Each structure stands twice: as structure tokens, then as C-alpha cells.
Short mmCIF file of C-alpha atoms in Angstrom, two decimals:
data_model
loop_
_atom_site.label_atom_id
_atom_site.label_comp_id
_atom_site.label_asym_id
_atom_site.label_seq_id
_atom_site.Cartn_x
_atom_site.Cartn_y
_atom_site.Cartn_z
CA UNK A 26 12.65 11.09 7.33
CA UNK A 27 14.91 11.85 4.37
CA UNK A 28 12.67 11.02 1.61
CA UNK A 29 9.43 13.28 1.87
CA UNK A 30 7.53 11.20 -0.01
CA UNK A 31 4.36 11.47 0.99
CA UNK A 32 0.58 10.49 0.04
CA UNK A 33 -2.63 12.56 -0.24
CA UNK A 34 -5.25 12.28 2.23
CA UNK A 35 -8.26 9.71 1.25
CA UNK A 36 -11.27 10.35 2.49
CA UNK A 37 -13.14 7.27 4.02
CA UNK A 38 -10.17 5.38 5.13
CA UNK A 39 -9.34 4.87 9.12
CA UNK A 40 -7.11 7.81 9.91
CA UNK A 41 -3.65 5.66 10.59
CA UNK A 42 -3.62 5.66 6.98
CA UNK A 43 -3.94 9.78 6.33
CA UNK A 44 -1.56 10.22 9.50
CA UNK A 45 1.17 10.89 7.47
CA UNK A 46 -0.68 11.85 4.43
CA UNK A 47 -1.22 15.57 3.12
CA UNK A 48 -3.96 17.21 1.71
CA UNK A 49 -3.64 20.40 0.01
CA UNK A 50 -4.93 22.71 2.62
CA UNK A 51 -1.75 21.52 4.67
CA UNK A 52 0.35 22.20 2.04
CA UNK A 53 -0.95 25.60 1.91
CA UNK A 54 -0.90 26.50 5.48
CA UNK A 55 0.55 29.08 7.28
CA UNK A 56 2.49 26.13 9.36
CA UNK A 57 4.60 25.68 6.13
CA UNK A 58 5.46 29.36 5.78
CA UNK A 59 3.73 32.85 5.70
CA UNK A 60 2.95 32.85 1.87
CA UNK A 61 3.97 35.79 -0.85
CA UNK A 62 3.26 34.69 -3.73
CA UNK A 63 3.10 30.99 -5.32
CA UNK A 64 3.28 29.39 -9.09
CA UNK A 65 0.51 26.51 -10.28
CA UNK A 66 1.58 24.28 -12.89
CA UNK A 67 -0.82 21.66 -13.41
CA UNK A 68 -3.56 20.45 -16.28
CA UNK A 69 -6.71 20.61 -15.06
CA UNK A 70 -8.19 23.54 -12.51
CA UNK A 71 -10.53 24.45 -10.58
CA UNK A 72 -10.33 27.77 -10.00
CA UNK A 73 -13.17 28.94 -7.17
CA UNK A 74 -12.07 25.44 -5.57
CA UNK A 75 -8.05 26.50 -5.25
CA UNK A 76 -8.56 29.49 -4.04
CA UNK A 77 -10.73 28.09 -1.34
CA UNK A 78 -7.56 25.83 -0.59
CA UNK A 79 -5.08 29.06 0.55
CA UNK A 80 -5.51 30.15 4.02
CA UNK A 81 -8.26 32.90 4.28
CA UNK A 82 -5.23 35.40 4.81
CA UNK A 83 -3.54 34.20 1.55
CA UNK A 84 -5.92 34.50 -0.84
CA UNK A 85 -4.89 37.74 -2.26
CA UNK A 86 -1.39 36.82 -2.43
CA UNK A 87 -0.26 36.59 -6.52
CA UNK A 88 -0.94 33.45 -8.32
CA UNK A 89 0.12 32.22 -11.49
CA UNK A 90 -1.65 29.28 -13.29
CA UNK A 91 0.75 27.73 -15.66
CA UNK A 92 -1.50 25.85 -18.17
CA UNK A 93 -1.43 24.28 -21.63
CA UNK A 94 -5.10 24.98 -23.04
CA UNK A 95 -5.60 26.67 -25.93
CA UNK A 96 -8.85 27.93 -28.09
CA UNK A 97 -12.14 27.47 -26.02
CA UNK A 98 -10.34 26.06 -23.54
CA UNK A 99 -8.07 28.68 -23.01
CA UNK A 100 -10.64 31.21 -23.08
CA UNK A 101 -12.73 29.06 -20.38
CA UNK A 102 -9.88 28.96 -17.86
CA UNK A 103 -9.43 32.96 -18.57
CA UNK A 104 -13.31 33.17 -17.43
CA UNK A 105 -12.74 31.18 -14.06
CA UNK A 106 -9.89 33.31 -12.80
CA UNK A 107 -11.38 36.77 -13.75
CA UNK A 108 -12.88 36.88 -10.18
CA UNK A 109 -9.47 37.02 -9.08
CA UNK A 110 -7.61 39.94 -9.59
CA UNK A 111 -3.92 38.35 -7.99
CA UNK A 112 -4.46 35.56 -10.42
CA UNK A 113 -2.51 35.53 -13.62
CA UNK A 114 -1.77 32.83 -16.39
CA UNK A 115 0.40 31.70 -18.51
CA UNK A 116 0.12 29.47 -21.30
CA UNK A 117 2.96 27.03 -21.80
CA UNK A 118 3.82 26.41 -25.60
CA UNK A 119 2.73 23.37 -27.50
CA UNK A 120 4.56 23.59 -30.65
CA UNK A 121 4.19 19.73 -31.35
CA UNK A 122 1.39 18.17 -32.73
CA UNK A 123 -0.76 16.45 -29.47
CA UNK A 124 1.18 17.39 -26.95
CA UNK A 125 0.01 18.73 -23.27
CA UNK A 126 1.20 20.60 -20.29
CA UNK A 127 0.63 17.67 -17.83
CA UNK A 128 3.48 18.84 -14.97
CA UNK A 129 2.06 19.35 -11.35
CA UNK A 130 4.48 21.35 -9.24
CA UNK A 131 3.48 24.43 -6.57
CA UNK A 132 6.72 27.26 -6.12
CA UNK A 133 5.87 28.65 -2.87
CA UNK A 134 7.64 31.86 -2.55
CA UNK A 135 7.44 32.67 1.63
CA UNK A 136 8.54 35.52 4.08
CA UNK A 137 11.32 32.88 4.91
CA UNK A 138 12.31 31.24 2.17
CA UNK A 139 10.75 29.43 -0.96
CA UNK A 140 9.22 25.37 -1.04
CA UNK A 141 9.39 23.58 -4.00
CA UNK A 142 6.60 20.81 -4.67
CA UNK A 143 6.32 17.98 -7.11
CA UNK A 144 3.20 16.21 -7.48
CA UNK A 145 0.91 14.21 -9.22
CA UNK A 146 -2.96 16.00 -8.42
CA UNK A 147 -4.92 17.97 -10.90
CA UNK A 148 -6.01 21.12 -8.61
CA UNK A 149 -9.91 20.03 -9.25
CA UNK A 150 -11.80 18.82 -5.69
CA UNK A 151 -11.72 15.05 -6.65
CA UNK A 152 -7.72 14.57 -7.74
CA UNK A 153 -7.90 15.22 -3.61
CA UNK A 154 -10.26 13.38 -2.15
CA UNK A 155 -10.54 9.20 -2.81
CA UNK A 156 -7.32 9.26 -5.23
CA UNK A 157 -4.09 7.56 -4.51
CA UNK A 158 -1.79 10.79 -5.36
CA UNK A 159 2.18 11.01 -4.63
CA UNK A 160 3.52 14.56 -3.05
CA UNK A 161 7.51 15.48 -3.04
CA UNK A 162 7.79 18.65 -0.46
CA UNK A 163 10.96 19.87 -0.89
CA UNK A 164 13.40 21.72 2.29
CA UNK A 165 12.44 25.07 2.97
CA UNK A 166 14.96 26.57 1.13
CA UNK A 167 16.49 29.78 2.82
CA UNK A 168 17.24 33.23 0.73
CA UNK A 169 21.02 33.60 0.03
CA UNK A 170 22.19 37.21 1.50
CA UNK A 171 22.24 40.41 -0.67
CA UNK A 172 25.67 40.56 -0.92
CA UNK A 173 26.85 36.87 -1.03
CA UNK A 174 28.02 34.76 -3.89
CA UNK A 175 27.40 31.13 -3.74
CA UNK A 176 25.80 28.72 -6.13
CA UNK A 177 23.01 27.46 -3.85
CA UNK A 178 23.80 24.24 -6.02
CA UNK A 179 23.02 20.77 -4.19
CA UNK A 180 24.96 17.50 -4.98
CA UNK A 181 22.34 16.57 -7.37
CA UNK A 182 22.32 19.51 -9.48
CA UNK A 183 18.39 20.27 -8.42
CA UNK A 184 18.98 24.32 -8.56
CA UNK A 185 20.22 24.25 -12.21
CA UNK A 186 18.16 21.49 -13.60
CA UNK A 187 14.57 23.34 -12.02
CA UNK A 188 15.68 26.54 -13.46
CA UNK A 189 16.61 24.68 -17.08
CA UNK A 190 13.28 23.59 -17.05
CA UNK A 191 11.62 26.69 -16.49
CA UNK A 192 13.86 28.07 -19.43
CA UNK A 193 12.42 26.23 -21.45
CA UNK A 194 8.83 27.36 -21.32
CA UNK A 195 10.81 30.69 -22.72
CA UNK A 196 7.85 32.83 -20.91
CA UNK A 197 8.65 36.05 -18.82
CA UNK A 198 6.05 35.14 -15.57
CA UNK A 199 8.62 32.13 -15.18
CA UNK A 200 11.61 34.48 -15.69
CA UNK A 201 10.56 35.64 -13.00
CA UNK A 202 10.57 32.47 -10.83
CA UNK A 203 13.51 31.81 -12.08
CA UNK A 204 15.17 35.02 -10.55
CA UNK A 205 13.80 33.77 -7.20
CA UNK A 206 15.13 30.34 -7.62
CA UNK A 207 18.79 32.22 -8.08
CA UNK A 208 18.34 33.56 -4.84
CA UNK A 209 17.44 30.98 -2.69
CA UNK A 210 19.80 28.03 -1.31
CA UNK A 211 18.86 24.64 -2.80
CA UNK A 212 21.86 22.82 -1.91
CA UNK A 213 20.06 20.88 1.05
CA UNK A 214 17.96 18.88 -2.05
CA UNK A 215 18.56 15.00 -2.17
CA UNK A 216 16.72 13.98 -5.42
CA UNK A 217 16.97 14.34 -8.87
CA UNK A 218 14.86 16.77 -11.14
CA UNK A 219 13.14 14.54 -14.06
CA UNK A 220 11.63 16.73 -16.69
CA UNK A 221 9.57 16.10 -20.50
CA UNK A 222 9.15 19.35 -22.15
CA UNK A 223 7.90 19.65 -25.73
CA UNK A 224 10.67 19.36 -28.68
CA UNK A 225 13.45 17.01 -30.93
CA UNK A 226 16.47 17.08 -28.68
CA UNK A 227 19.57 16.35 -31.02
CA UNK A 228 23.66 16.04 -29.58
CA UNK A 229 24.33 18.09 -26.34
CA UNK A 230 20.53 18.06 -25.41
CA UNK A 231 19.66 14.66 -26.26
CA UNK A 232 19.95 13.78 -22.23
CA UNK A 233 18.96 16.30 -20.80
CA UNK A 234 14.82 15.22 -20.84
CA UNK A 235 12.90 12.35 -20.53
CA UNK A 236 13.48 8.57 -20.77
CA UNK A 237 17.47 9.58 -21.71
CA UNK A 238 17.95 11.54 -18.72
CA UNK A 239 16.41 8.77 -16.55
CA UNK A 240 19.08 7.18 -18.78
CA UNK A 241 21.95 9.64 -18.07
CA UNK A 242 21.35 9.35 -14.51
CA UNK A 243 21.60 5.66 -13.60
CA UNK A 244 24.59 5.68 -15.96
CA UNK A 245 26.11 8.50 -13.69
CA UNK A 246 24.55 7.97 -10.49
CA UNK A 247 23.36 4.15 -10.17
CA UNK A 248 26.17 0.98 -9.77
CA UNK A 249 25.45 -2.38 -10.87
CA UNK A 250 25.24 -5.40 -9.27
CA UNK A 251 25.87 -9.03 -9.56
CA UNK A 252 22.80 -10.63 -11.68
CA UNK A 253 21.19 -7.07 -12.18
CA UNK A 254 19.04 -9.17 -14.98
CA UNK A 255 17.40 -10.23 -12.51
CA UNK A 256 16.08 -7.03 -10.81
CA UNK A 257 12.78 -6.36 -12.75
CA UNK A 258 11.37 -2.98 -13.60
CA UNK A 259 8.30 -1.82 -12.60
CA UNK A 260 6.05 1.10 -13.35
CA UNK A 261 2.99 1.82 -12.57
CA UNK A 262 0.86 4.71 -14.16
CA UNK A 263 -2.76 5.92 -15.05
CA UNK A 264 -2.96 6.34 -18.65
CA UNK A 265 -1.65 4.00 -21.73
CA UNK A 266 -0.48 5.92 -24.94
CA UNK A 267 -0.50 4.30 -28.41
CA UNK A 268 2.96 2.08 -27.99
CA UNK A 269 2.79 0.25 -31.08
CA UNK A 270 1.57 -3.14 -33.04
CA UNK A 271 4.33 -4.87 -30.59
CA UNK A 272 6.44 -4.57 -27.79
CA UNK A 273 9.24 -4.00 -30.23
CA UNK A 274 8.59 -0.65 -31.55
CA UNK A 275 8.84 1.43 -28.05
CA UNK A 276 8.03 -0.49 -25.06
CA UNK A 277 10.68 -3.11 -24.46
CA UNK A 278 13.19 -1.58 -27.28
CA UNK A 279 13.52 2.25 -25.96
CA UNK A 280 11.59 2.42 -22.91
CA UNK A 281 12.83 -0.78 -21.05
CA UNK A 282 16.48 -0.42 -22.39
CA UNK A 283 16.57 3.33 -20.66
CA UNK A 284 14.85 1.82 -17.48
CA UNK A 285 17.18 -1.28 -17.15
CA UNK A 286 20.28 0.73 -16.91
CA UNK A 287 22.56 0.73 -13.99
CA UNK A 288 26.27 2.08 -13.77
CA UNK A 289 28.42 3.18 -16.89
CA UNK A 290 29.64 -0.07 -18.51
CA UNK A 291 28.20 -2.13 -21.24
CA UNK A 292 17.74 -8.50 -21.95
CA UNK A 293 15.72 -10.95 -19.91
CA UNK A 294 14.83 -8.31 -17.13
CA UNK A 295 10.87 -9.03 -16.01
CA UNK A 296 8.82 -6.29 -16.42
CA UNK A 297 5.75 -5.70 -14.73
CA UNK A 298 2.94 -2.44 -15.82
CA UNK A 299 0.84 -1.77 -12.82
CA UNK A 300 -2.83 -0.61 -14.13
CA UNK A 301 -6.25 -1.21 -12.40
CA UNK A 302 -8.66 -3.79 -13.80
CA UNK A 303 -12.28 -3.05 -14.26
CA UNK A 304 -12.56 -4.79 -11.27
CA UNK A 305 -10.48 -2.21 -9.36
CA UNK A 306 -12.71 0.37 -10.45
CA UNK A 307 -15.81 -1.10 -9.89
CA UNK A 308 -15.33 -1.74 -6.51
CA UNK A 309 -13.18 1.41 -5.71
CA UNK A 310 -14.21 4.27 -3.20
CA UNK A 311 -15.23 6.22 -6.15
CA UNK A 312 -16.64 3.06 -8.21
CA UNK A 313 -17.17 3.42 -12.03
CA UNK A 314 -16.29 7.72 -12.14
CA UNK A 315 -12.79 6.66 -10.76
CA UNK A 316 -12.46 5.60 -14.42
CA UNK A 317 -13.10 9.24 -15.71
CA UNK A 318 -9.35 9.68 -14.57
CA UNK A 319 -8.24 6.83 -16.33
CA UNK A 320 -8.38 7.29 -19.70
CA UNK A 321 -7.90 4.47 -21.94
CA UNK A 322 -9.62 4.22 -24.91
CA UNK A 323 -10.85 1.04 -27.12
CA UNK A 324 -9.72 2.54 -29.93
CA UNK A 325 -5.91 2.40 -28.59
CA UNK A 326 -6.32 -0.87 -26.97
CA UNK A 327 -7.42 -2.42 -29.20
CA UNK A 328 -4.53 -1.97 -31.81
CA UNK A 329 -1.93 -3.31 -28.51
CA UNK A 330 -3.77 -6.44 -26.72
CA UNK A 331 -0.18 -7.84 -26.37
CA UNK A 332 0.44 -5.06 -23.87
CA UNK A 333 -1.93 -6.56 -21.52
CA UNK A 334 -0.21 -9.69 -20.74
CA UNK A 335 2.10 -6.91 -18.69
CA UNK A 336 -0.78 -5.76 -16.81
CA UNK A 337 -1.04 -6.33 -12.94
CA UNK A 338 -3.66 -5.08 -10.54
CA UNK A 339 -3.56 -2.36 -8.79
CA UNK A 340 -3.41 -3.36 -4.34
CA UNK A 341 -2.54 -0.72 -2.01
CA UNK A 342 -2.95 -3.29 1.58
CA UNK A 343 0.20 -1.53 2.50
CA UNK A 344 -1.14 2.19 2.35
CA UNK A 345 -5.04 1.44 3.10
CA UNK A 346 -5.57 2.64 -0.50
CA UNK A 347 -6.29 -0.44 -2.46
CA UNK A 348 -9.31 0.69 -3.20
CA UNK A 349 -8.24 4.73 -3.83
CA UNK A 350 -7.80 4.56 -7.38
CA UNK A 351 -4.05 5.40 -8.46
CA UNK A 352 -3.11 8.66 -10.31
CA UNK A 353 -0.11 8.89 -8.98
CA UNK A 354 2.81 7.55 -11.63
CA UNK A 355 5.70 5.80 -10.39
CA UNK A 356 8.66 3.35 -11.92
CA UNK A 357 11.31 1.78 -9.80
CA UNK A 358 13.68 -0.89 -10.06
CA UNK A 359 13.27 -3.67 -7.44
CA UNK A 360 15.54 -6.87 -6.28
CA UNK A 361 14.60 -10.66 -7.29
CA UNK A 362 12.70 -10.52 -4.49
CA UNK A 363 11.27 -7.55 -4.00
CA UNK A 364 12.63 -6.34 -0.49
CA UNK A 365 15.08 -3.43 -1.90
CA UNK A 366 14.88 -0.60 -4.91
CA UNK A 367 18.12 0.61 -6.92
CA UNK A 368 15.83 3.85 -7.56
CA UNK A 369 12.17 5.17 -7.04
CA UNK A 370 10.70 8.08 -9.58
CA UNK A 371 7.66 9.76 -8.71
CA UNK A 372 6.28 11.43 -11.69
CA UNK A 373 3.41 13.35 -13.93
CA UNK A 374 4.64 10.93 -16.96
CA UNK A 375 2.27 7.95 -17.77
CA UNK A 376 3.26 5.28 -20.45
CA UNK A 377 3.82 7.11 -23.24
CA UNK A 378 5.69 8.43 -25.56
CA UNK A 379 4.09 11.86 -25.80
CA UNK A 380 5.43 11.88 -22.17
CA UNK A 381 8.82 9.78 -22.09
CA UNK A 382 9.86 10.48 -25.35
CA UNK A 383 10.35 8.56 -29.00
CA UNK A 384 13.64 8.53 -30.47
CA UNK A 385 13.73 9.71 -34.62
CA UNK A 386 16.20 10.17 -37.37
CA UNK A 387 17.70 6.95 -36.97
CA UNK A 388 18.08 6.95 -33.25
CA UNK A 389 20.09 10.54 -33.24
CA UNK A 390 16.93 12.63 -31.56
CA UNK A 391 14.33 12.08 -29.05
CA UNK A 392 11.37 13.73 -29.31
CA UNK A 393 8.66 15.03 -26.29
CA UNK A 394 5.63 16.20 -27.07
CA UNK A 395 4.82 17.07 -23.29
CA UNK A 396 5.26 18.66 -20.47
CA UNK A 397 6.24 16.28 -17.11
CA UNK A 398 8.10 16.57 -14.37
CA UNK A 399 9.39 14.14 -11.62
CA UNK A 400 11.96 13.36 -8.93
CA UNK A 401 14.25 10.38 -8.62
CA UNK A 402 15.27 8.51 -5.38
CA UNK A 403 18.92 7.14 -5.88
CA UNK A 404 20.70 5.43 -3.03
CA UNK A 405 23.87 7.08 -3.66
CA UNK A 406 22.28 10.64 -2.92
CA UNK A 407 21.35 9.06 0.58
CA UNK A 408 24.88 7.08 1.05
CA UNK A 409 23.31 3.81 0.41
CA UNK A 410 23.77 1.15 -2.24
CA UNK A 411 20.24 0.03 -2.50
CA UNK A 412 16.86 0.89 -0.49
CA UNK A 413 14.98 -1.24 2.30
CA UNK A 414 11.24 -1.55 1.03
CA UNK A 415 9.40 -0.26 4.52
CA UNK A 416 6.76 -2.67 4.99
CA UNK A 417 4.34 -1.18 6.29
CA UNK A 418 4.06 2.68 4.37
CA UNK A 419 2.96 4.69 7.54
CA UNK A 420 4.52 2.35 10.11
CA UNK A 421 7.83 2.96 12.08
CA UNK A 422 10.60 1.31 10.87
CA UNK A 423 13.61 0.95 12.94
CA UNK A 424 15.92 2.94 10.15
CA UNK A 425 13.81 5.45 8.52
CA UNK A 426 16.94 6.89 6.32
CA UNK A 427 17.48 3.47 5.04
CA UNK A 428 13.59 2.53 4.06
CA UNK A 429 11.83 3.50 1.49
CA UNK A 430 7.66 3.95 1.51
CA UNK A 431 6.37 1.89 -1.34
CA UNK A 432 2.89 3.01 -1.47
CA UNK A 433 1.37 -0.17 -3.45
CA UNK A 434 2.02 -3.87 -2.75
CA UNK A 435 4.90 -5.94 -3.81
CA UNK A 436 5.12 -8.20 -5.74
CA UNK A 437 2.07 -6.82 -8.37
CA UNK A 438 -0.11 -9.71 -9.03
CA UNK A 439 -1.04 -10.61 -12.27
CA UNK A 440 -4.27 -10.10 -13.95
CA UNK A 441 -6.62 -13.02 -13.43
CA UNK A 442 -7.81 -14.34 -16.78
CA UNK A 443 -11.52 -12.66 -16.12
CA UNK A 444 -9.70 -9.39 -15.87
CA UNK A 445 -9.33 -6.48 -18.34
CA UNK A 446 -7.89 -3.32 -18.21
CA UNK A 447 -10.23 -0.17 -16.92
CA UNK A 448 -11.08 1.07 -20.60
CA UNK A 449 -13.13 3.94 -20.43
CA UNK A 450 -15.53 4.87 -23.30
CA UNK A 451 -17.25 1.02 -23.32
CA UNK A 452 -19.93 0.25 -21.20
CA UNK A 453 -19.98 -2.01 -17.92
CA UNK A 454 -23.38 -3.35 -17.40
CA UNK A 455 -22.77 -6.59 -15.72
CA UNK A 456 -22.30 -5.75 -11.93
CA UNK A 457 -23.20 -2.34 -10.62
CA UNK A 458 -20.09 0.07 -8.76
CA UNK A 459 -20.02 0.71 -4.84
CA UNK A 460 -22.59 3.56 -5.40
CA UNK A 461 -24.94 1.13 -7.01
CA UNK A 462 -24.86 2.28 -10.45
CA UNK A 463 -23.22 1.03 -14.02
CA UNK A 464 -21.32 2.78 -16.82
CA UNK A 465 -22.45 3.54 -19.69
CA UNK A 466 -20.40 6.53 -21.77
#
């Protein structure tokens, strides 16, 4: 298939549902290339646990964990790898004010060639194991000849855009990677690179991160179509930021405006936020610790209960996973009826603007406070117009290139009026989880 999109595996459910899926250990396998060295970026890590995730004959191969923790925390990730004498670190820069390194991407440098993948998985034992979590393997991409001159460049500008956002970190381990990303051929790469990294983006750079280059690329790259106020936007995350006393101020004045473009010429568009209930998490594989990875706090919520009227469960029937609690993040723009996409994004970035971006002076600069990274599915970089929702995510449809794995069902009902969103430091002491127990913070 052209899209290699692909789930993790979840333990528990019948195995047509992880046929098709990938855990990590068959990302790192020897089947996907004979390993020389590899790059970690991610938030969270377990450091005994990924090493036990490389094949017993890669684990002294050179790793670098590229991490945003500072202080204590910095000092405690320092103790985990010492063990490891092929591990190395380095700490991304977080010059604005609550800001963290949240992207999740593996560079797998091989004997023949170099992988690129984008994720959405903390490297700790349970991002892996009853999560719903969305993979993007790249090609293999092969090593241009000593010798040769060509751009390795694909239609989609991935090769420049990948190493722009390593530049940006402005650290010398990722120098590095970025050498070996100028000699390897990217050109076979069909999506878009997506990237949040930490500053106030002014003129020439205002597009080039964020919710403006999601922007900059449907203006460029998306057409659109008779009664295109009538294709809703979805997204569909794990975390809430702080948006505001109303959806005014960010959510449905910034946000939505950059998500309902289409095409380059000059709103009533639906919107619907895909979050679990409390009722999701109780009765999820995990029960009430699912929540743990869903971090919502009163304290926000409570300043934006007219965000909640967006809210819609989260079901999975599709996938098997509707009770594999979601961290994977994903926005796409579907038709009145829900059976084709003008563009799928697969992304680190919850709903926020630490992650998407907040426009300042006067609407002249956006600024990030994060780290994120994503890829983005347009029909033009496939020689479509729009996508075919596959109905079925692991079943075989009779035009793959045309159909496009959904992982969650469509359309996202509503909240019932019993429902709430999962908020996670308040107790739940009414009905006890699928292990039997409550939660109480």
C-alpha cells in the first residue's frame, strides 16, 4: 500500500486486528535492515526497556536520545543510560517559557540505506502495549554514490523540510544526522513533513511551522470543492491545552481557520474534537491508569466548559481498538458524509497552542513553544482528488492506493449528556475500572 500508515500492536485483542499492526521490536528488526546506528527523539524513556527492544546483535550499535528534560530530570535520564556506553544524549533547547520536546521519530541509519519513522509512542513499555498509537515507516531510502550529484529531493520537499527541522535544534549530534540525510535518496517520499519547534516566527518563516504550514500546504497542495463548508474538520488528540474563556480566542478563530483551508483563493464548517469520556477509560483495556496518559487537568477545564460541547467519544469498531485508549493525534478533513478525506495528518501535536502555535503582535508572528512533528496525506501527492475511507482498517479493499485506513469510527458520536471528559487529577469512585479498582489521585 502507498500510505504506510500503520497501528501499534495491542495486546489482548484477536490477532486480525495486530496483523497489520507493528510493535517496536519489528521496527527494530534485522528484517528492516542490518542496523548502524539510530537517533531517538521522543519525551518520555525507558532506557533498560529500549535497549531490550534492538535485536540482541544491535544493542551496541550508537544511540542518541534526543530529549527535552532539564534539572533533576535531566540528570535522571543521564543516570538510566550510563549502563550504556553507545548511548549518548542530547538535550533539545527550550528557550520559551513551558515548552517541551514532545516529537517521536526513530532515524535508522542501516548497512543499506537509512528509514525514517514518525510516530506517536513514548519509548516506555506501556505507550506499546494496550495504546492506540499511529506509526509512519518511511521507504528505505538508498545512499546516493560517492561521486554523484543529485538532490535526493522528493515531490514533496520531505529531504529539505526533515533536515530544516533538525537545523533548528542548532545541536552538533544532529549535524551529524543531517550529513547522513544529504547522502541518502529521499525522493521516493509521498507525504509532507509537519513540524512545531520552539520560537516567534516573523515574515519569511512565519509558514514554515505549525498550524501556518498546515496552512501553507492546503493553500499549495489541496483544491477546493463545490460546498467545501460543508466538509467538517476533525481532530482527534490526547491532551487539551488552556484555549481560552471562548472558542473565539484560538480554537475556532486561528486553529479552525488554518484547518478549513483548501486551494489558494479567498465559516459554518462543523467541527468535531475526538477525546475519550470517563467512560472510555473506565472500561478500557487498561481501565482508570489509561488516564495517566491523558492529562487533563480540572484546573484547565474548568476555565473552558464550552469546549466540551465539541467533545465526541472515542470508538475504534473499525480497528478492534475501541477500547485501546488513543495517544495517537490525528486531524483530517472529511466529506458531508464521511466516506472521503481532502487530507489525513498523523502527528505528536495535541490541542494546543504550545504545540500548534498562537499568533502575536497583531497577527504578524506565530509563536511555538514545542517541539512536534507529523506527516500529511494529500491526494494530490497520490494523483487523487480526494481519499476513499477503507472501511474496514485491516481489511482488503479492492483499491488499496485509493483508500485510506481511518483507524477510529466515522462519524464521532457525540457525548451523551452523562458523559464528561477523562480529567485526570479528580477522583472516580462511582463504578470500579476493568481491573476492579477506582481512581483516586
Amino acid at each position: 500500500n502507498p500510505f504506510q500508515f500503520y497501528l501499534t500492536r495491542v495486546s489482548g485483542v484477536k490477532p486480525k486486528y495486530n496483523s497489520g499492526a507493528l510493535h517496536i521490536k519489528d521496527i527494530l528488526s534485522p528484517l528492516f535492515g542490518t542496523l548502524v546506528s539510530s537517533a531517538q527523539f521522543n519525551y518520555c524513556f525507558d532506557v533498560d526497556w529500549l535497549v531490550k527492544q534492538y535485536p540482541p546483535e544491535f544493542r551496541k550499535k550508537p544511540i542518541l536520545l534526543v530529549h527535552g528534560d532539564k534539572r533533576e530530570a535531566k540528570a535522571h535520564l543521564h543516570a538510566q543510560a550510563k549502563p550504556y556506553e553507545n548511548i549518548s544524549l542530547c538535550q533539545a533547547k527550550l528557550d520559551i517559557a513551558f515548552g517541551t520536546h514532545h516529537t517521536k521519530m526513530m532515524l535508522l541509519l542501516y548497512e543499506e540505506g537509512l528509514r525514517v519513522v514518525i510516530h506517536t509512542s513514548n519509548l516506555i513499555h506501556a505507550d506499546w502495549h494496550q495504546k492506540t498509537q499511529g506509526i509512519w515507516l518511511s521507504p528505505l531510502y538508498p545512499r546516493i554514490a560517492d561521486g554523484t550529484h543529485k538532490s535526493g529531493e522528493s515531490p514533496t520537499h520531505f529531504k529539505a523540510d526533515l533536515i530544516s527541522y533538525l537545523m533548528a535544534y542548532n545541536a552538533p549530534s544532529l549535524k551529524e544526522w543531517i550529513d547522513v540525510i544529504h547522502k541518502h535518496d529521499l525522493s521516493e517520499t509521498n507525504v509532507y513533513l509537519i513540524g512545531s519547534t520552539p520560537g516567534r516566527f516573523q515574515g519569511s518563516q512565519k509558514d514554515n511551522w505549525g498550524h501556518f504550514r498546515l496552512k501553507k500546504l492546503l493553500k499549495d497542495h489541496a483544491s477546493s470543492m463545490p460546498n467545501a463548508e460543508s466538509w467538517p474538520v476533525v481532530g482527534q488528540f490526547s491532551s487539551v491545552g488552556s484555549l481560552g474563556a471562548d472558542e473565539s480566542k484560538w480554537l475556532c478563530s486561528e486553529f479552525k481557520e488554518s484547518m478549513l483551508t483548501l486551494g489558494k483563493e479567498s465559516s459554518s464548517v462543523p467541527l468535531y474534537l475526538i477525546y475519550p469520556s470517563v467512560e472510555n477509560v473506565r472500561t478500557s483495556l487498561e481501565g482508570y491508569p489509561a488516564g495517566g496518559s491523558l492529562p487533563y487537568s480540572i484546573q484547565t477545564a474548568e476555565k473552558q466548559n464550552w469546549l466540551h460541547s465539541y467533545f465526541h467519544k472515542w470508538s475504534a469498531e473499525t480497528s478492534g481498538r475501541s477500547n485501546a485508549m488513543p495517544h495517537i493525534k490525528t486531524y483530517m478533513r472529511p466529506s458531508p458524509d464521511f466516506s472521503k478525506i481532502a487530507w489525513f495528518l498523523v502527528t505528536s501535536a495535541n490541542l494546543s497552542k504550545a504545540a500548534w502555535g498562537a499568533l502575536e503582535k497583531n497577527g504578524t508572528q506565530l509563536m511555538i513553544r514545542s517541539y512536534e512533528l507529523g506527516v500529511l496525506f494529500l491526494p494530490s501527492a497520490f494523483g487523487l482528488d480526494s481519499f476513499k475511507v477503507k472501511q474496514k482498517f485491516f481489511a482488503g479493499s479492492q483499491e488499496p492506493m485509493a483508500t485510506f485506513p481511518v483507524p477510529y469510527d466515522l462519524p464521532p458520536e457525540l457525548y451523551g449528556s452523562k458523559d464528561r471528559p477523562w480529567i485526570w487529577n479528580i477522583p472516580y469512585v462511582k463504578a470500579p475500572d476493568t481491573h476492579g479498582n477506582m481512581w483516586v489521585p
